[PDB]
């Protein structure tokens, strides 16, 4: 044996094992969903309540990399934070070099190449977080992208990462997301989150929602408290 020690040796069947171990490390995080609407995208995160001592709003899993791009993560928190920092630095460097907000199709590529640089040499280890990027522009539409530890960047109408990826994406696809605008999407997201993680696995949790689109002048931010109050009240009826 001994072929799975370093990230520089191929197995006889022809694949790298460390990256597979990393992906299995990802598959134990909580859960996160992101879907695109007519004119924007919506993220949604469920945060488990480990104990009563912590506060709400702690260890935010939603990061606003730039003034107009949002990020959601799943994996190890520290690696996620480091990647967020490098992405933010890349965006600012690009603005200074040229002079306008960076498009997604370039920022995602830069982050992907930088991540992929950590799977060749034996002096470092591969990362342990998988993340999602979203944004909207008035002249560019709504953009969603997903990136994994291996270094693959793909585009989605709507996707989900975490423990129950398959279960969630079963009900992601039923919705007609091609037309209906993302003002009623939020209720759908609350409903689709409350139908997973049974009470047997854990008792209580909390919910985070984000927002982007021309509905908020293209900026990316958090949803108001009353809106999520109404959405949660609505999703309370779906358990019937």
């Amino acid at each position: 044996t001994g072929y799975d020690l370093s990230a520089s040796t191929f197995s006889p069947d022809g694949r790298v094992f460390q990256v597979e171990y990393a992906m299995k490390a990802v598959e134990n995080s909580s859960t996160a969903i992101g879907i695109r609407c007519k004119d924007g995208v919506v993220f949604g995160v469920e945060k488990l309540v480990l104990s009563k001592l912590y506060e709400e709003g702690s260890n935010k899993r939603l990061f606003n990399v730039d003034r107009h791009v949002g990020m959601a993560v799943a994996g190890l928190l520290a690696d996620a934070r480091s990647l967020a920092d490098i992405a933010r630095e890349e965006a600012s460097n690009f603005r200074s070099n040229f002079g306008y907000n960076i498009p997604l199709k370039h920022l995602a590529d830069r982050v992907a190449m930088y991540v992929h640089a950590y799977t060749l040499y034996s002096a470092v280890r591969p990362f342990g977080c998988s993340f999602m990027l979203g944004s909207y522009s008035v002249n560019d539409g709504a953009q969603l992208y997903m990136i994994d530890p291996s270094g693959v960047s793909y585009g989605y109408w709507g996707c989900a990462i975490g423990k129950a990826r398959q279960a969630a994406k079963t009900e992601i696809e039923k919705l007609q997301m091609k037309e209906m605008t993302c003002r009623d999407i939020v209720k759908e997201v609350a409903k689709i989150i409350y139908i997973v993680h049974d009470e047997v696995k854990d008792k209580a949790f909390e919910l985070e929602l984000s927002w982007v689109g021309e509905l908020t002048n293209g900026r990316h931010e958090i949803v108001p408290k009353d809106i999520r109050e109404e959405a949660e009240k609505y999703a309370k009826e779906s358990l019937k």
């Binding site: 191929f10 022809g14 190449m113 992929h116 060749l120």
Partner: protein, 240 residues
């Protein structure tokens, strides 16, 4: 057959072989795709297949074809991230050649420099030798079209018709039998042969939403991606 560290690093086996390179070649087949390239009398054509297992995935961002230069095109086989890295390297090298010498790069020199860059990896004991294979098509003045192929071990060569992927052997057999006819070649003939080769190897009888085609001709050297409409035209005209 081996003793010590022949199975972990790129060092010589007692029988004269070395395995860490022989493993990349079978690492090529992990994706499960195939591509074919044909050189005509005054045209060059490449055909590839794409697979989209689910509706959530945006079908417009899975193209394996990339545009290196206004006169040179490339097609990719193998893993994903390594492919992107090698593509970026090629683009950068061509741009530097243009800056330094002031005229366009011939296709052969570019392929040589990329393969030579690959060769260093199989010389040291820190890196992985990049398991993804490259196909290039272009037009050279006073020489007509030209088709070249580059492999992970560093062995580049110019062919007349090639296939890379899971089914290399039977496709090469079919192409050899066909090219033995020793006749003239035109655009329609090239495209028809290239389509039917893959069609019979996989035995699918497909639809116009599963195959991508790139061409170049000596009337307008600009590499271009065929629109779905004219792809359908070729496909229906082929079936008498």
């Amino acid at each position: 057959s081996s003793a010590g560290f022949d199975r972990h690093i790129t060092i010589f086996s007692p029988e004269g072989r070395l395995y860490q390179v022989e493993y990349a070649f079978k690492a090529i087949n992990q994706g499960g795709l195939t591509s074919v390239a044909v050189r005509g009398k005054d045209c060059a054509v490449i055909v590839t297949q794409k697979k989209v297992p689910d509706k959530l995935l945006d079908s417009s961002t899975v193209t394996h074809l990339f545009k290196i230069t206004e006169n040179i095109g490339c097609v990719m086989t193998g893993m994903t991230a390594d492919s992107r890295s090698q593509v970026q390297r090629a683009r950068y090298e061509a741009a530097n050649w243009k800056y330094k010498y002031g005229y366009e790069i011939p296709v052969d020199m570019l392929c040589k420099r990329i393969a030579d860059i690959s060769q260093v990896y199989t010389q040291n004991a820190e890196m992985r030798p990049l398991g993804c294979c490259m196909i290039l098509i272009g037009i050279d003045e006073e020489q007509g079209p030209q088709v070249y192929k580059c492999d992970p071990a560093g062995y580049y060569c110019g062919f007349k018709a090639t296939a890379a992927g899971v089914k290399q052997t039977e496709s090469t057999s079919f192409l050899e039998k066909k090219v033995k006819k020793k006749f003239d070649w035109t655009f329609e003939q090239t495209v028809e042969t290239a389509i039917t080769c893959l069609s019979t190897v996989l035995s699918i009888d497909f639809k116009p939403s599963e195959i991508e085609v790139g061409v170049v001709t000596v009337e307008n050297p600009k590499f271009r991606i065929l629109t779905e409409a004219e792809i359908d035209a070729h496909l229906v005209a082929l079936a008498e």
